[model samples]
Target: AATGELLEKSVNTIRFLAIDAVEKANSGHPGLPMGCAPMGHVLYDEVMRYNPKNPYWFNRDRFVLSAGHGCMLQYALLHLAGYDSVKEEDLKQFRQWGSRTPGHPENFETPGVEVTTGPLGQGIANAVGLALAEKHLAARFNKPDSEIVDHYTYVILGDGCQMEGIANEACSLAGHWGLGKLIAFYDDNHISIDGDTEIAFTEDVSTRFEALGWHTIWVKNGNTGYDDIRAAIKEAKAVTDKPTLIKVTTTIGFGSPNKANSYSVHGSALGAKEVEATRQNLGWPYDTFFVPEDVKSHWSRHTPEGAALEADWNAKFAEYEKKYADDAATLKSIITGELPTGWVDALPKYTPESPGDATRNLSQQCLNALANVVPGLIGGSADLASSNMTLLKMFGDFQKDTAEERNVRFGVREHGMGAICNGIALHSPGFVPYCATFFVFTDYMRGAMRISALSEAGVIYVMTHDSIGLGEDGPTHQPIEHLVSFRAMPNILMLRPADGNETAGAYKVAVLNRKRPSILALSRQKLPHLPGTSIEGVEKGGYTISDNSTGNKPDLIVMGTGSELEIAAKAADELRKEGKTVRVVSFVSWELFDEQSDEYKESVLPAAVTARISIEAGSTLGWQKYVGAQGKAIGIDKFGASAPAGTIYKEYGITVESIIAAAKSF
Candidate 1:
């Protein structure tokens, strides 16, 4: 067979495998894979430099399926790419439990798959992040002799991605950052879940991207114009000043005689009749999940090509290692996720007599300290740098020309900020990308945050203004339920440190937990360097900072995190003066506390202490687990008032007096 005929054959094989998997699972979006097959074929087969043998090769081009409901498209492409993990048998197990091939592409589940991106618009943001990482690393690490850290980030995003605001935000950043190596293929099939995009999304996508500072190109015929796809990619690579968006128009359910270009094929699999009709229309003779022999033999070159590509990089890296020994050592440590010995010594230590400061300020100190010791620590706030206090000392902006420095100015796009950080984290084990914003604004980026947890991206989300203590910002700015909401999320470290020592400890934990995302809800209000607080104490998640009672039992226990912990401390002091046996506990992270040994948890808060009074400025939800059946939880259950920080505390009943009253009642 000729090359074009063979290419067409491979593309159809991809289409059929997707249809069969969706058909077998009786679920998933089939239209995207059907429509996107040509692009996938062109990318995986021709354009990309990925290693199937060593999937985590640092210099390999990264591919993210931004329209991840079209995961079968990626699966088929990975299968053809000769990845051992995505073998033919695994393709049959798509969406099945205990199968490597899940409904969405997961980095943890499979090799060759980059980031988890089933959610609309997140993948593109992640792609932007991946490209961002490449640009930064290449600028910092590469020399004229060895351009070792070079690679491109490619993505195929559909209508949903274009419609979502996150895509716009991240793409805009991509344009501003001048991520020249980022190439995006817009699968302009013009069909959304609701039907024609004309009904809901008729805006000129190309012009929008152009205004956002991207080089835009269009291929009018995407179905059979394989040369056009190749040519478009060539042009994108030739334009090195900005990222490129190649919008390729194609039939949504290509080859499906009845469902093609219709909403019926957008998500659902074609019926048996339609499937049979599709097979006839495409001149496909084989049965379900079939691949022709020539197609398999033709595509098998990738395994060797991938291996050779990595081998060449390894050789180049070996040479670079000799010339730049110290830089190589740092880069090696980052790549291996290995911490420098005694790097924890960099964390600021505080004592009871230390001057009081806001937790957000303490967080900045911790960032600066840890960053000086750790090479991988990089990120910034979402246009709240002054407020969030996330600037790394002595670093300049991470710009197109100045990628040597480490600050990432994410602007005010919270949703895209989180998604982009997730991408950066997923790019390498050494990349600890932390992003920040006001705590309440987590509402804007919760979806991306959830994906970070799900994808196991070790992103440190430095959330400031954790409560009404921000003052004058009112209900909209205060994070009433944010703390408890994050606590409810699985695989997240929801930490609310009380003071400087605890803040430093939170950063330590965040750095060590390269597989778990941590959200540090810090305060804008000043908090004292309390007695009995230690970095080790924060590791336990919950600890008794001040206790007077013996035998692991107190008459009453007062528990709080962050600013309220100070109140609990003061209230415990008052109770002690009143001749009452009282104990104060800092419940910094409920999840990490639950992970502790039963004995450790019992030591922190004894089972006998039923008379518990909890203090938190936010919602009372989930505090009952520790506060107990008879315990009283002092907090703001309603929206906050626009008053002074102290006033909000008094009015909302989250004060030292409130804690004392609750303890007295118990």
Candidate 2:
């Protein structure tokens, strides 16, 4: 059989499978699959290497579809490549409930999908993270005699993904960091949801990438240019200093007689008439989801080849281990997600006699300790390292020629920083990638943060200058509604650690839960180490710090988080002096508290206790649940003011006087 004949047949097999799935589901973007089928086949069949049988192979090249609306392309490729996760029935039930093929590419739902991508550009950032992870591991573990960890990361992004600012941020970092193995194929079809690129997007994408220091190429006929794509990829690999972007221009909804280049095919299903017309036009007169025996045989070979590739790598690793036992052991632990025996013991403990320091300082202590204990812990701040206190004193920056260093400098790209860490977190089970910024700056990275919960990427977000306590920076730098907003997110830990003990506890939870991200809000001003706060108390989310109650009931219960917990304790003392039974609870994390046993919850916040007062430096939203209907919540409901920390605390009514007054009224 001629190679061209087999190539077209295989490409058409990919195209028709995607078309039929979207046609059956009655919803999906068929235009991308129709247009980029050739690119998919060339990459999967000729360029990339992976064992579909073992999808999580550490050394296997990673592929991410940034434009997730066209997930059929991925599902089809996965099925053809022999992944058990995506069956023909899965394609048949595309977008249906209980199907592995969801509307978007969710990494948890589908074994082969690399990352969750629906909000446009984050996928590209994720790819950069994957590449970064590979480079870091390779740099740290590989010796002159053996390259133990080596792999590439490939991504397919479209106009909408390119239009995203997050992509530019990640791409700029990728170039600066010299990610030579990161390759991206841009689907330049000149059509978006609203129609042609002229309406909203007409920038020179290739030139833009060039300006960012990326090697650029143009594959002018991606619809049928298998040779051109292969040549471009080969050309990309020869240059080993910068990432590459191959802009592949093709007609949207290719082979469709009438709707081919129109925006109608961008997302909507190509009607039955157009489908039949496309089948005839592409000379693919086969039933829905048809897989020719030749194409099947062609793709089936990937299984054994991938097996051979992994086996050879394993043998090489064994040889490398014989020479460098410690390196091998560390790499194995990092790859397998196994923590060392005493890693938990490395978290510092505190006492009331301990010197008072800001929670941010305490957090820095935990970070430096954890970095020494956990070899896989790696990250840095969004140019706020000094303020966020996220620096690991033991490690150096992960720069262009210094990939072995653990710290990463993400510059001012908060959005990219969050998304890239998601990639790193998902890259390996053992990796604990963290990024930091001011507590108020979460708005800049909200998209990636939301996906962290949605995709189950445990990227530890270290947030500092938590409240109006940040002072002179003013209202713009203070986070009032952030606590409540993150609380609303389904699977995130919204932690506001009160003191040193609680900060260590926050890092513990963030490291332990690899599925959910943790946000640690630290203080700017100094906070005293209270008697009752403990790592155990922090784990439970909410716990009693001190109580003079009897029979599991108090006349009044006061709650606070972060710097305000001292106010709660002080208010409890004033109330106790008045002969009132008062209990003070530290609300370290609401999510963790929600996960506590019902008995534990009742024991902490007794169901019958209605005389409660909650004081936090932020917004009053959502405090009603804990304070009860008859109780009061003392919080800053409006924007903050620029003043001294103590003055702002007093002005905003987040002081011990305010708490005591509220408690007396209750």
Best model per lDDT: 2
Kindly give the number of clashing pairs for every candidate. 0, 0
**TM-score, each model?**
0.99, 0.99
lDDT of 1 at 501: 90
Report the lDDT tens digits of candidate 2 across residue range 608-644: 8999998998889899988889989999889988888
Off by over 4 Å in 1: none
Model 2 residue 309 lDDT score: 89
Ten-residue segment with the worst summed lDDT in candidate 2? 1-10
